[PDB]
């Protein structure tokens with residue numbers, strides 16, 4: 269017989285939950301049956317205990333069972349996401365969002381899950397004239413006609429509203445901050461997944477491993493929830509139900525070391541102008557980081573029909589990402605995406 | 613600017629708060645400005661980080677500042693409390709309440725802070741079944757104290773601004789640092805006490821808060837988990853005197869008490885527990901009496917600490933003798949009757 273006092277007691281006692289308990293909690297939360305105080309207690313207690321991959325899998329799984337799906341057979345088998353936990357506290361430019369446009373322009377289907385923020389990916393896309401607010405059918409059409417779509421989290425996860433409000437009221441990051449990347453309603457099988465929390469990246473990787481995804485979970489060793497250019501990054505490579513953790517250094521591909529301030533963003537307008545600069549061919553630290561993350565996504569996608577080995581896949585990813593920019597394909601794709609939105 | 617994200621982030625990092633942060637959080641909670649989610653996040657985060665005496669002192673001090681006080685010059689200088697955190701999970705007979713009556717009958721003024729269970733039957737519930745009026749305001753508690761030798765401050769009467777916290781406590785069910793606040797926020801501010809703690813890891817923090825106040829207190833945890841001095845085994849006692857704490861292991865066998873079993877101290881509903889009080893005050897021998905005598909002696913020892921630093925073993929011997937005499941002279945049974953009579957005179 270599950271209950272709040274039982275589950276919360278177990279977590280405050282610093283014990284892992286029994287199987288099913290996390291799912292019960294999340295389902296109470298998703299059906300509107302949990303009091304705000306219970307939601308907050310659970311989010312915090314799970315965080316301070318240190319969630320396991322099995323527990324987070326229950327959370328994300330239950331949350332997905334309440335999401336609006338995309339229609340049958342509208343998401344290609346090899347679609348990729350580019351998305352992070354956020355909360356790295358460094359207010360960067362929208363690296364994942366820029367990378368996603370570049371990856372799509374390179375010919376890889378992209379279905380990005382995202383949200384508002386502090387200009388978040390959704391805010392920046394909105395400021396660029398992209399329609400962020402589309403329902404399942406129109407997202408699937410975006411994907412078919414433009415090669416990219418965007419699932420706005422509030423539109424696809426209406427039942428999460430009680431949790432979202434508690435997250436706003438308490439402000440502190442929790443286990444819930446992990447769920448965004450794990451509950452893309454289109455369920456792409458590949459992804460470049462950023463984690464700001466060094467010790468939870470491994471947990472996120474474990475969740476993806478139990479899905480058969482081909483994913484790179486990445487954490488900049490400077491704290492970025494992206495592949496960084498200022499130093500090394502830790503990568504948890506996920507494929508075939510297993511994890512291969514490694515240290516990644518972009519100097520090995522000839523990237524100059526950048527400073528973190530050179531990647532700082534601003535409001536929606538500033539971050540939109542940064543997008544247009546990069547897609548127009550402006551060289552510099554921001555382009556470098558976009559190219560780096562776009563290549564990472566391309567590598568994860570390569571992991572699905574896994575011909576290539578790691579190094580050759582990276583070399584191919586970097587070349588495709590750079591060419592997608594330099595040939596104007598990325599600029600053109602964004603314009604195409606905006607036109608699509610404007611056609612009703 | 614203190615804020616929830618700043619304070620909760622600190623706690624979730626496993627760091628002690630900066631000075632004043634716990635006080636800010638408690639101000640928010642006591643003014644109705646903290647959302648239920650913020651209250652619960654804070655209660656839980658403070659519990660899992662492991663609260664310090666300074667943090668809990670801030671919570672308790674702000675809480676006391678919002679409480680109704682007794683009127684000026686109505687609490688004796690040497691009043692004592694006998695109270696625990698509850699939450700030992702054992703559902704015993706009301707040991708603290710029985711001890712309080714015996715202690716007052718031995719001539720030590722008692723002002724008890726308490727509440728309902730709100731089960732099977734808390735101190736407040738049992739007193740009510742005995743015909744004691746638990747629901748009295750400051751002026752009448754003061755009068756009871758002067759006329760009978762004992763008073764009872766009903767927590768919801770004296771701490772109305774705590775209602776947001778109390779509702780959250782009930783919603784989450786799980787024990788938190790807030791479970792420590794009852795014993796630390798007696799609105800009469802007695803300076804001595806026998807204080808039970810059901811959570812062994814937190815008894816030392818409670819002690820530290822009493823030490824910062826220069827109270828004479830024994831904070832006790834039965835090694836069987838009871839928030840009282842037990843007779844089923846040894847107890848841990850943090851003795852607070854002269855603004856300092858030292859930890860002791862206490863064995864009642866050394867005063868000639870036989871070992872009892874938990875079930876010999878098991879409670880029932882308010883009526884059953886009332887009958888247990890009446891049996892003990894009537895002079896019935898057995899394990900409930902033994903437990904009451906022991907806890908009464910402890911409060912008497914704490915009270916003696918106000919004006920002494922007398923030797924431990926003699927202090928206990930006299931405490932136990934005074935508690936036994938209070939029952940066996942009829943004084944305790946008589947005191948309860950005087951207390952019941954006082955409440956009936958109010959109309």
Ligand SMILES: O=P(O)(O)OC[C@H]1O[C@H](OP(=O)(O)OP(=O)(O)O)[C@H](O)[C@@H]1O
Pocket residue numbers: 694695696697698699700701703705706707708709710725726727728729730731732733734735736808
């Ligand atoms: O319901 P629980 O969490 O187990 O708590 C049981 C009782 O212990 C505390 O009181 P106190 O020590 O004043 O009363 P008692 O020892 O006489 O019952 C609390 O206020 C309850 O009255």
Ligand SMILES: Nc1ccc(F)cc1C(=O)O
Pocket residue numbers: 351352353354381382383421445448449
């Ligand atoms: N971080 C996220 C990533 C994707 C998403 F859809 C939502 C969030 C979020 O935190 O609100």
Ligand SMILES: Nc1ccc(F)cc1C(=O)O
Pocket residue numbers: 383421422423425426427428429430432433
């Ligand atoms: N329902 C939601 C789902 C995801 C999210 F990030 C926010 C909301 C919200 O209601 O604010």
Ligand SMILES: Nc1ccc(F)cc1C(=O)O
Pocket residue numbers: 727767768769771772773774775776778779
């Ligand atoms: N106000 C209160 C003060 C103390 C307490 F224990 C409970 C309440 C309550 O409202 O239930």
Ligand SMILES: Nc1ccc(F)cc1C(=O)O
Pocket residue numbers: 695696697698725726727728767791793794795
């Ligand atoms: N346990 C307690 C001891 C004294 C008090 F005033 C309140 C409580 C309580 O938690 O309701």
Ligand SMILES: [Mg+2]
Pocket residue numbers: 350351352354362363364365462493494
């Ligand atoms: Mg990102």
Ligand SMILES: [Mg+2]
Pocket residue numbers: 352354356360363364462492493494
């Ligand atoms: Mg980021």
Ligand SMILES: [Mg+2]
Pocket residue numbers: 695696698706707708709808839840
């Ligand atoms: Mg008690």
Ligand SMILES: [Mg+2]
Pocket residue numbers: 696698700704707708808838839840
């Ligand atoms: Mg007790």
